[model samples]
Target: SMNPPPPETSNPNKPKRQTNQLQYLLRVVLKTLWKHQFAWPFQQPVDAVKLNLPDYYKIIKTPMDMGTIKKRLENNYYWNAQECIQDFNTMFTNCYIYNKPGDDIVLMAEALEKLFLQKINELPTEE
Candidate 1:
């Protein structure tokens, strides 16, 4: 028999109908990023002092790294796939600021972003 509709709270501002599907898809994206050859540099936070770049902190204020992104995903900070994509963009934008144009790291970031976008596009479309 078909079940009757029950009373439940609804928040139009916070839609969770697609949360589970997005989570699984995002995990797959993260796994691919972690295995990328150029991903080593982005795996963790940058050590400005250790790297001898005094300007790093001053130039890059919003430091975004893959590790932090992963943790944020696990912590439910990203309410939607678009939010996750924005974080990835921020991470690459930060790289562009600190690294020279056409530098290896910058190129790597471009490549990674391309791969990320591709994966994002491969996700199933909304019904």
Candidate 2:
């Protein structure tokens, strides 16, 4: 009988792995939504494979680099509520729009903006 495929092995030297691009983006968006809007924090850090959005400019500066964003997500974990919200807004406004199917661009933009506003409301007040 053919030998069973070697069991997947994780390298201690390497960082935790993430899922695919679509999934990564979705997870980031969802996680952000949960933390910012719903006020729910994941029990553990989320892994978003290949999703990296370092700065707001990154999404627009290199649209094709959305792929890299996906990769970044895979290696990152966000337990900080603030960072999670920032990353979601940045990625959605910049990257997600590019992946849209067609028209409704204006509508989608409006919706994302609204969602962001709603999230902001959920944050803790210093005063």
Candidate 3:
């Protein structure tokens, strides 16, 4: 079983296709974020694949912010975001997976989301 032959690499956009487990969760979040981010004023939820710089700018609604955020519309931005999440997930893995870790990627992502939400919730209280 030394060399089982390399696996086919297609549909790199899908989370299930990723070799890394954390990605499946990040992909879910990223897709949803894009969906909500691009949702039309009088339409149903928008498609992530159809989201672009103009729509992103429309959502953010600021010349300064839009200028910076617009670049994320490109394909590289997704890979960059994916890589960023990969690093963030690494911290949780180091903390939770050192001795033993949960195999459920979705669970990890949910917990991670809660962890951040808990922090964000404190902001309002502290002010």
* Candidate 2 per-residue lDDT over residues 1-127, each given as its tens digit: 1222221222346444333433434364454544443232111221222233234232354222222333345445422344334555554455354445554634554465576566465455432
- Per-residue error at 115 for model 3, in Å? 2.9
lDDT of 3: 0.33
Ranking by lDDT: 1, 2, 3
Steric collisions counted per model: 0, 14, 0
Quote the lDDT for 8 in model 1.
22
Q: Which residue runs of candidate 3 sit more than 4 Å off their true CA positions?
A: 1-79, 100-113, 117-127
What's the C-alpha lDDT at position 80 in model 3? 33
lDDT of each: 0.73, 0.40, 0.33
Highest TM-score scorer: 1
Please report the candidate that would top lDDT against the real structure.
1
Give per-residue lDDT, candidate 1, residue 21.
39
Cα lDDT of model 1 overall?
A: 0.73
lDDT of 1 by residue, 1-127 (tens): 2222321223345534447536655577877888999999888777776677777877876777887777766656556677667778888999998999879989999999898878777666544
Candidate 3 similarity to native, TM-score: 0.21
Candidate 1 vs candidate 2: the TM-score winner is 1
